[PDB]
Amino acid sequence: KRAIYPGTFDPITNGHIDIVTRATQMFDHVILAIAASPSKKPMFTLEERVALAQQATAHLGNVEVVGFSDLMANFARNQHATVLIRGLRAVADFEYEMQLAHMNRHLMPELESVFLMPSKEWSFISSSLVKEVARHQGDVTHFLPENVHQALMAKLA
Amino acid sequence: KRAIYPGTFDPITNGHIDIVTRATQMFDHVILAIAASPSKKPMFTLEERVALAQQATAHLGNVEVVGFSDLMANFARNQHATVLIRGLRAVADFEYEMQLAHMNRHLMPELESVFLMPSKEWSFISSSLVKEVARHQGDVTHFLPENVHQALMAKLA
Amino acid sequence: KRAIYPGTFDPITNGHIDIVTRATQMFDHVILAIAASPSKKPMFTLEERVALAQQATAHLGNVEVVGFSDLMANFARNQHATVLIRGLRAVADFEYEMQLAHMNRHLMPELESVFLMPSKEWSFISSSLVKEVARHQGDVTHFLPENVHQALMAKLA
Amino acid sequence: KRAIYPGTFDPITNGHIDIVTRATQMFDHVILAIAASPSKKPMFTLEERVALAQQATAHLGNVEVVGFSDLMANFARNQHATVLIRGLRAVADFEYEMQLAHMNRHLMPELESVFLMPSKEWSFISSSLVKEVARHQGDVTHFLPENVHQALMAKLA
Amino acid sequence: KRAIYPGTFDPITNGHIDIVTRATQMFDHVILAIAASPSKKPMFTLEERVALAQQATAHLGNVEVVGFSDLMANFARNQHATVLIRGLRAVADFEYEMQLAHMNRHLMPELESVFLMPSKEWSFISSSLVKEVARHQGDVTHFLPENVHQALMAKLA
Amino acid sequence: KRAIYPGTFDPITNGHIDIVTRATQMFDHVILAIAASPSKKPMFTLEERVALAQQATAHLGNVEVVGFSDLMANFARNQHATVLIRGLRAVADFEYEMQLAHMNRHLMPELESVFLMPSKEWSFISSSLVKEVARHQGDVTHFLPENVHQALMAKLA
Ligand SMILES: CC(C)(COP(=O)(O)O)[C@@H](O)C(=O)NCCC(=O)NCCS
Ligand SMILES: CC(C)(COP(=O)(O)O)[C@@H](O)C(=O)NCCC(=O)NCCS
Ligand SMILES: CC(C)(COP(=O)(O)O)[C@@H](O)C(=O)NCCC(=O)NCCS
Structure with missing residues (x-):
């Protein structure tokens, strides 16, 4: 059972980690697929x-x-x-x-969409808002893995 | 992996059959669990x-x-x-x-809730709607398994 | 064109009057059909x-x-x-x-469902709410046709 | 400023305690009003x-x-x-x-409705859900005040 | 009875055809109005x-x-x-x-908004997603009239 | 009790006036905070x-x-x-x-979010739509304070 977890992950958050972790407990192999050519x-x-x-x-x-x-x-x-x-x-x-x-079912019927639910802790945050807040001098340390936190500070510096 | 598909299934419709089928293609064993649901x-x-x-x-x-x-x-x-x-x-x-x-995650954290999406064909039906239509002698053969339609026909009128 | 406006209308409110009125300006004849709705x-x-x-x-x-x-x-x-x-x-x-x-389209495909939008004045009322307020002796004259208010007053207390 | 927090509170949960607490930090006096709500x-x-x-x-x-x-x-x-x-x-x-x-604004325009948001911890619970779980002997100690849990335990079984 | 069906129709889809067809069965003349100066x-x-x-x-x-x-x-x-x-x-x-x-009712009260429902077949697709998919090498033939299909291939070539 | 009512207010509408007025009746001082550096x-x-x-x-x-x-x-x-x-x-x-x-609660726990409801009159309009309409030769006089109306005409002239 090979599962794919696609997204822009710009950047990856604790919510993403929560979801992918839950997925690895149900399926043998999980491909965390990062979109290479966004529009934004x-x-x-x-x-x-x-x-x-x-x-x-x-x-x-x-x-x-x-x-x-x-x-x-x-x-x-x-x-x-x-x-x-x-x-x-x-x-x-x-x-x-x-x-x-x-749409994805139309494109590839053999790919079954499964929806997972993150912890209540990450149920109200999005990467979009995290970036916005960080870019405007807000603390978003709580929502990101340490490595992502360090990278974000350097990015906004 | 053992999965449990719980519900009242009063009665089980083609929508439920659609969901359980997608479930069996994803997990080794699937237990369709019917709750007594007396309050209903x-x-x-x-x-x-x-x-x-x-x-x-x-x-x-x-x-x-x-x-x-x-x-x-x-x-x-x-x-x-x-x-x-x-x-x-x-x-x-x-x-x-x-x-x-x-609530289920609180009672049993290792039980991961997975959400599947039915075919467009069954996206607007429910056991409730089917029963209401049947109570008015409307044709619901299209939304129910053969044995279920017979049972519903016999149950009513 | 003959149109049918179905509902329980228990009781018919100014909201319903608003909708049926817009309907008559659009179609030649309008049948306001009141369902028995015993289950309600x-x-x-x-x-x-x-x-x-x-x-x-x-x-x-x-x-x-x-x-x-x-x-x-x-x-x-x-x-x-x-x-x-x-x-x-x-x-x-x-x-x-x-x-x-x-469901209605399935039973009668030639019956086209049309949705109309009520005035802002009646966008937050329902027969249910009006009855609940009336059961507590609240003034609902503003949301009901004269004859309906009298009937509702007489029906209660 | 005198505020009134109305509801059925059947029973009052930690969610309600969360809301009323936020209310007291905002207004001088808060009246937690429990409606008879016989229709429920x-x-x-x-x-x-x-x-x-x-x-x-x-x-x-x-x-x-x-x-x-x-x-x-x-x-x-x-x-x-x-x-x-x-x-x-x-x-x-x-x-x-x-x-x-x-509807309340119509009956009493000077009564301003204020909406507060509970903690993420209580964002998915309700008196109804807690009762359903309790009716099935599930552990709900986490969502109710001590005295309320005892009362709910005693009330059931 | 003259009805207007406005939109950007960029490009027109089977969902649009479904809607306009249903409209022509209720009203004498239907103007499929195409927005000439979008922002996008x-x-x-x-x-x-x-x-x-x-x-x-x-x-x-x-x-x-x-x-x-x-x-x-x-x-x-x-x-x-x-x-x-x-x-x-x-x-x-x-x-x-x-x-x-x-807003449109405010601008022109004599223009009554009527909402129609497409077939389940086109109830989950939008021109926005169709373009996105096509632009990214996805098959969207199923959602477009043949002439629109041919034009889209030439456009993306 | 100091309350803050933030937004872009581009431009301020009757809906905004409605909300801030209701707020001034509940709290001692209200700061109508206008966002200085939007992205749009x-x-x-x-x-x-x-x-x-x-x-x-x-x-x-x-x-x-x-x-x-x-x-x-x-x-x-x-x-x-x-x-x-x-x-x-x-x-x-x-x-x-x-x-x-x-997100704001995470950033500043001591800042309690309170949601107010505007009159039905302004419950279906947004500054976004008002600008769009005005920019496209539509009448939006009804939604703006006189001074804002005069300023908008000069802006679009
Ligand atoms: C039967 C069901 C899955 C709901 O499914 P339904 O929408 O098909 O009626 C739910 O009510 C249930 O789990 N019932 C068993 C009693 C229980 O444990 N209830 C708490 C669920 S959080
Ligand atoms: C009365 C109504 C239009 C619902 O309207 P309501 O929301 O005003 O109660 C609907 O329940 C109905 O059509 N009842 C007749 C019985 C029937 O055919 N039901 C199936 C409807 S798909
Ligand atoms: C109790 C409540 C606040 C609803 O709260 P609930 O969702 O906790 O049951 C409401 O039903 C109420 O105000 N009941 C008193 C009777 C009444 O005046 N009803 C009309 C309310 S608009």
């Missing part, structure tokens, strides 16, 4: 995001961090993934998640 | 709902149908399940799901 | 709700008030209606509406 | 719910617990309150809140 | 969008495809439209649709 | 927005209009505010408001 230019580059994610999940043996470009479904297919991990926060855009799941 | 004054008795579900899933070798009146978390632990399956078809079916999911 | 244990009998609605819409020459206990789709077909009217005032009043709408 | 067939009698709330808030010197069967707006006016407190933990708990809020 | 620059130009829409609705006799600039309400007024067609997908932003409907 | 470039400059807001709230004695940059929470802290005013429209993005409230 990232705060961190693909290479940086991959490095941060690799370090943050170094302790997770069955987790593989890999960057990818173009369509996520095409990458999942080539990686032979049959499970698509999606984190559902309390503040998630449910309607959007439904569009995404149905 | 079910149309069919627990024994009836169990028989209907057993027949409706006879073709699924990895599905085991069982009834229970225990606390969901205790039953899951006692059934040796570590994954809890629930279907998501609408926003309303999200806030309520998070409460149960977090 | 209506405050007023079907006969009472029909009389209240008839009086409350006496000024609307294109509105016909009728009661029914049949399957909504069959009644619509038998009334020669091809448009089904429903009001939308909130998100909750959307997911539930889509289920009925898709 | 409360588990505990009004007298019982009042006693449970009184004990659960004994440490809060600015909180006054009272029971009422009157129209919420009239009781608020008669209690000389000008602020109405309500907690928000989910979307569902928003559309329903706006209806009551606008 | 279109994938296809206004002229292209009009050509694609005209071809895709060539079989619909009472449909008129027309481009317009500035305020939709001002165009509707000059076109003497009294019905404003809005498609409501399951994944629609309901709150936004309410803002839009109320 | 404003229609009106910070200086203009402050001037417009000052004029529009000139009649409100306990209201202080002040511009601020960087993190709102840091400004609130330095201003010694303990109440954070948030307006909740019927068309509000509730999930987003929850993210914001929780």
Whole structure:
């Protein structure tokens, strides 16, 4: 059972770690796929995001961090993934998640979308807000792995 | 991995069959657990709902149908399940799901709640709606397993 | 074009009057159909709700008030209606509406469900809320047609 | 400023304690008003719910617990309150809140409805869920004040 | 009865065709109005969008495809439209649709907003996602009229 | 009791006036804080927005209009505010408001978020839509204070 957990992870947060950890307990191998070509230019580059994610999940043996470009479904297919991990926060855009799941099912029926729920601790935060806050002189240490915290300070300095 | 798909299944519809089927393709064994749910004054008795579900899933070798009146978390632990399956078809079916999911996580942290999405075909139906239509002699053959439709027909009028 | 505005109308409020009025300006004939809805244990009998609605819409020459206990789709077909009217005032009043709408489309595909939006003035009221307030002797004259308020006053205390 | 926190509190949970506490830090005096709510067939009698709330808030010197069967707006006016407190933990708990809020504003315009947000810890619980879990002998000590848990234990089984 | 169905239609999809077709069955004349001056620059130009829409609705006799600039309400007024067609997908932003409907009612009270529901087949897809997917090497043939499909390939080539 | 009511107020609307007025009736001093460095470039400059807001709230004695940059929470802290005013429209993005409230609670626990509800009159409009409409030759006089109306005409001229 190969599962894929795609996203921009710009940067990876404790919420992401929470989700991927829960996934590794259900599936044999989990590919943490980092989107290589966003439309929004990232705060961190693909290479940086991959490095941060690799370090943050170094302790997770069955987790593989890999960057990818173009369509996520095409990458999942080539990686032979049959499970698509999606984190559902309390503040998630449910309607959007439904569009995404149905579109991905259309593109690759053999890839089953599964939604996991993070701890209440990370159920109300998003990478978008974390960056915004950090960029505006706010403390977001609590939401990030130590390595990501150190990298973010250098990035905003 | 042993997964438990809990619900009232009063009656089990094609929507439920859709969800349990996706579950069996993902996990080794799936226990479709039917709760007594007396506070809901079910149309069919627990024994009836169990028989209907057993027949409706006879073709699924990895599905085991069982009834229970225990606390969901205790039953899951006692059934040796570590994954809890629930279907998501609408926003309303999200806030309520998070409460149960977090409550179950509190009672049994190792029980991971997984949410699956049904086919577009069954995204707008529920046991409740099917029963209401049937109570008015409307054709619901399209939404129920054969044995269940017969049972529902016989149960009414 | 013949349109049918179905509901329990227990009792019909100014919100309903608002919707049916917008309906008459759009379609040639509008049938305000009151469902028996026994499972809801209506405050007023079907006969009472029909009389209240008839009086409350006496000024609307294109509105016909009728009661029914049949399957909504069959009644619509038998009334020669091809448009089904429903009001939308909130998100909750959307997911539930889509289920009925898709179920009715399944039973009678030529019956097109149309959703209208009430005035801001009636966007937060419902028959249920009005009754609850009235049960506590609160002033609800503002939300109900004159004849309906009298009837509600008489019905209670 | 005198504020009134109305609800059924059947039973009062740690979530309610969280909300009322935030209320006392904001307003001089807070009246936790427990509605009879007979249509809800409360588990505990009004007298019982009042006693449970009184004990659960004994440490809060600015909180006054009272029971009422009157129209919420009239009781608020008669209690000389000008602020109405309500907690928000989910979307569902928003559309329903706006209806009551606008209805109360109609009955008593000077009564300003204020919405507070509970801690993440209590964002997914409700009296209803706690009771359902307790009816199945599940451990709910974590979500209820000590005296309330004892009372709930004694009330059941 | 003249109805207007406004949008950017960039490009027109099967969901749009579904909605406009349902509209032509209720109203005498339907103006498929294509927004001429978006803020987001279109994938296809206004002229292209009009050509694609005209071809895709060539079989619909009472449909008129027309481009317009500035305020939709001002165009509707000059076109003497009294019905404003809005498609409501399951994944629609309901709150936004309410803002839009109320703003348009403020601008032109004589223009009544009517919401139609597409088939379940097109209830979870948006032009936004279709473009995104196509632009990233995904197959979206299923969601577009043949002529639109051919035009999109040339556009992305 | 010092409360802060932050926002971009670009420009200030009747909805904003409604909310700040309700706030001044509950708290001793209200700081209407205008965001100085948005990401979206404003229609009106910070200086203009402050001037417009000052004029529009000139009649409100306990209201202080002040511009601020960087993190709102840091400004609130330095201003010694303990109440954070948030307006909740019927068309509000509730999930987003929850993210914001929780993030701000993390940043400054002593700042309590309180949500107020505007009149039904302003419950379905946003500054975003008002600007869009005005920019496209639509009448938005009804939603703005006279001074803001005059300033907007000059701005778009
Ligand atoms: C049956 C169900 C899964 C709900 O499913 P439903 O929406 O199909 O009725 C839930 O009510 C349940 O778990 N019941 C058993 C009693 C219990 O433990 N309840 C607390 C659940 S958190
Ligand atoms: C009465 C109503 C329109 C619902 O309206 P309501 O929200 O006003 O109670 C619906 O329950 C109905 O159509 N009842 C008739 C029985 C039926 O056919 N039910 C299936 C509807 S899909
Ligand atoms: C008790 C409550 C505050 C609702 O709270 P709840 O969600 O905790 O049950 C409401 O039902 C109420 O105000 N009841 C008193 C009767 C009344 O005036 N109802 C109309 C309220 S608009």
